[PDB]
Amino acid sequence: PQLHNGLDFSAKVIQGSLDSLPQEVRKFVEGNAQLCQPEYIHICDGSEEEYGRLLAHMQEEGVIRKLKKYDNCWLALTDPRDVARIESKTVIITQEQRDTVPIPKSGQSQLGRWMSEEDFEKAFNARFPGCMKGRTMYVIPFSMGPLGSPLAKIGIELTDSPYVVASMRIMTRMGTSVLEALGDGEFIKCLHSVGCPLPLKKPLVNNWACNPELTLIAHLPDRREIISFGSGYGGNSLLGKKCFALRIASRLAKEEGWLAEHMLILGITNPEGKKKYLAAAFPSACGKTNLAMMNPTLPGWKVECVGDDIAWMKFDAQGNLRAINPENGFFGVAPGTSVKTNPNAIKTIQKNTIFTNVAETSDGGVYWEGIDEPLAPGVTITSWKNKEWRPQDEEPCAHPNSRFCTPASQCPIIDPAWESPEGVPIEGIIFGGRRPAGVPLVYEALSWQHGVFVGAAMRSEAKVIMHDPFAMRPFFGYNFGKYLAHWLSMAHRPAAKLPKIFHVNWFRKDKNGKFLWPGFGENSRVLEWMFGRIEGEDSAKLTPIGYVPKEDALNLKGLGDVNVEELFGISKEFWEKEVEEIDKYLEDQVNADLPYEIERELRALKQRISQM
Ligand SMILES: Nc1nc2c(ncn2[C@@H]2O[C@H](COP(=O)(O)OP(=O)(O)O)[C@@H](O)[C@H]2O)c(=O)[nH]1
Numbered sequence: 001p002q003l004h005n006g007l008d009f010s011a012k013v014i015q016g017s018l019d020s021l022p023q024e025v026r027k028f029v030e031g032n033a034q035l036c037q038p039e040y041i042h043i044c045d046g047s048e049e050e051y052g053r054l055l056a057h058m059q060e061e062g063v064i065r066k067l068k069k070y071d072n073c074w075l076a077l078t079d080p081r082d083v084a085r086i087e088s089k090t091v092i093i094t095q096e097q098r099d100t101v102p103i104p105k106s107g108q109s110q111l112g113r114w115m116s117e118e119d120f121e122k123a124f125n126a127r128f129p130g131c132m133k134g135r136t137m138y139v140i141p142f143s144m145g146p147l148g149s150p151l152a153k154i155g156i157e158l159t160d161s162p163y164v165v166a167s168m169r170i171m172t173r174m175g176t177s178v179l180e181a182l183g184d185g186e187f188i189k190c191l192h193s194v195g196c197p198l199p200l201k202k203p204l205v206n207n208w209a210c211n212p213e214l215t216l217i218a219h220l221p222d223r224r225e226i227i228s229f230g231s232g233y234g235g236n237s238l239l240g241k242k243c244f245a246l247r248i249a250s251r252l253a254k255e256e257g258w259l260a261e262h263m264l265i266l267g268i269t270n271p272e273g274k275k276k277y278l279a280a281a282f283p284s285a286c287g288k289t290n291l292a293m294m295n296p297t298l299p300g301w302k303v304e305c306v307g308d309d310i311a312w313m314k315f316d317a318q319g320n321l322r323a324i325n326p327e328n329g330f331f332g333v334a335p336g337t338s339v340k341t342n343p344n345a346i347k348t349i350q351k352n353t354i355f356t357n358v359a360e361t362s363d364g365g366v367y368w369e370g371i372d373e374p375l376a377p378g379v380t381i382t383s384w385k386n387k388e389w390r391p392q393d394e395e396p397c398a399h400p401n402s403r404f405c406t407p408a409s410q411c412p413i414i415d416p417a418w419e420s421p422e423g424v425p426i427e428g429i430i431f432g433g434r435r436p437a438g439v440p441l442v443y444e445a446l447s448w449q450h451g452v453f454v455g456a457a458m459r460s461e462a463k464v465i466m467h468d469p470f471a472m473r474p475f476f477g478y479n480f481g482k483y484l485a486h487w488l489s490m491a492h493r494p495a496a497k498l499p500k501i502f503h504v505n506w507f508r509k510d511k512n513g514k515f516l517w518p519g520f521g522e523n524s525r526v527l528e529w530m531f532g533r534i535e536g537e538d539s540a541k542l543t544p545i546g547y548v549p550k551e552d553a554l555n556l557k558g559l560g561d562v563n564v565e566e567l568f569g570i571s572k573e574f575w576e577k578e579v580e581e582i583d584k585y586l587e588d589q590v591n592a593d594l595p596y597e598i599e600r601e602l603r604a605l606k607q608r609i610s611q612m
């Protein structure tokens with residue numbers, strides 16, 4: 001009801017109907033409509049007409065440009081203050097800090113950023129009241145995962161950014177069918193504003209609304225809410241991409257007994273027609289998308305991509321680890337993508353793709369560092385900062401965090417089961433990062449517990465070697481020690497078919513700084529070794545850090561002389577220091593929440609190293 005005319009926003013609805021929404025969805029929409037005071041409410045239906053009209057509207061506003069060399073491709077250039085996720089402004093809200101991060105023994109936690117409820121209420125009241133004035137509030141009903149999959153979760157994102165609506169349509173399953181499937185069910189509440197009510201108080205830069213000084217990306221897992229303010233960029237604004245898929249989801253998985261992980265999922269078939277599925281957790285810029293879309297060099301082998309970033313995994317009644325890719329598209333870093341490194345990505349992004357902060361060629365194409373493709377004479381390049389640019393000029397034409405956002409169904413090697421609601425059965429989990437020294441090309445963990453220890457000890461080159469356990473350091477939705485305990489607890493489920501755990505290093509370097517391994521499609525040779533190991537082949541040699549390939553077990557035919565002894569060299573001196581460094585890290589950062597079994601694997605590794 002009402003004593004006046006201010007609580008019913010039905011008169012401001014320019015698409016859809018508040019009556020057609022489920023009761024809780026309406027209360028979420030109307031309550032924040034009253035707080036944000038949008039001029040209009042647009043309930044997205046997800047149709048191609050709605051999407052084409054939004055795009056053309058953004059084109060006429062100057063928000064995006066059409067890339068004329070390609071079919072329905074678009075380019076957005078942001079405010080340079082709003083170009084990436086900002087970890088320092090990304091927070092999780094819980095009653096007790098220890099539920100979100102382990103209390104470190106001596107240092108500041110690197111494993112999350114907690115904010116008290118009181119502090120967040122102040123931050124929220126200082127940001128959102130009236131923040132959508134003069135703007136449309138879009139209501140985005142979206143499903144994370146195949147609609148109706150037992151692994152899927154549903155979200156509702158409110159945003160004043162049409163760029164977000166267009167990118168969410170690619171990255172999620174979006175629209176009227178989600179509302180119908182949701183019904184009276186539960187959903188994650190997603191609230192996003194770029195924080196620039198009209199009339200504008202501050203200059204608009206490059207037609208890109210943002211509010212960098214008030215940017216704050218908050219997660220409230222006990223209220224099932226994500227609340228993000230001031231940034232329009234990717235991971236801050238597509239609330240499915242990381243906030244939902246990893247931070248909220250990891251908390252939900254802990255409560256409900258599954259896993260939400262920063263993992264590609266791929267399907268690999270060998271020359272005998274056997275197919276296995278693998279998940280791989282690499283930190284950003286360590287090659288998940290290359291591996292997931294690999295063009296294998298080994299004859300007779302095939303790789304197919306289920307996902308390149310997020311896996312949700314649940315042991316089913318039969319004990320198989322079933323995984324879905326909860327996303328609907330790829331949000332890949334553009335620079336470094338070349339036909340040589342990732343030809344299947346190049347094919348993917350030529351249609352129906354939104355690019356952000358890359359360079360544009362005079363004939364309407366895209367350009368970026370590492371594209372490794374010559375331009376015809378006469379063709380010129382506009383930088384991502386909307387200025388003319390020459391190859392020898394001393395600044396990148398594309399921002400290093402620039403993106404393509406492209407439908408997954410367009411990948412030429414997308415796996416035929418990539419949308420199966422049952423998911424795919426994972427037989428192998430791979431960890432890895434950039435290590436210039438000391439870590440062999442590949443080794444296999446001795447046990448599930450050692451494998452969990454291996455993920456926990458992951459490190460990766462930034463001149464700095466940083467800790468990034470499970471590749472999830474920016475993304476843990478809760479206490480990392482309890483996360484380790486959660487992973488370990490999988491071994492105690494009866495019937496559980498624990499996957500083999502591997503660790504790879506594509507990036508070992510010789511004394512001149514040259515990569516010892518050619519990588520890319522040649523990684524199909526490492527995958528081949530893992531495939532055989534999962535089948536039980538006797539291809540492994542035991543070492544202090546785990547199993548490595550026997551001499552001549554790796555297929556190195558068609559390669560030059562790869563320096564195998566240095567690529568697989570294991571130095572007592574390096575590993576003494578490595579285990580020392582892991583010890584200090586886990587004791588400091590996980591402290592009282594470190595599982596016993598992890599402390600034990602650490603002791604065991606130290607002891608194996610001491611005897612070599
Ligand atoms: N040397 C080497 N570099 C790689 C390999 N795979 C990927 N890269 C590089 O790592 C960078 C990031 O790759 P990407 O697939 O975006 O990693 P993601 O950000 O984890 O998906 C790219 O510039 C690649 O060229 C590899 O096997 N060997």
Ligand SMILES: [Mn+2]
Pocket residue numbers: 288289308309331332333
């Ligand atoms: Mn990627």
Ligand SMILES: [Mn+2]
Pocket residue numbers: 488491492597
């Ligand atoms: Mn145990």
Ligand code: NA
Pocket residue numbers: 062063064076077078079206207208
């Ligand atoms: Na712009």
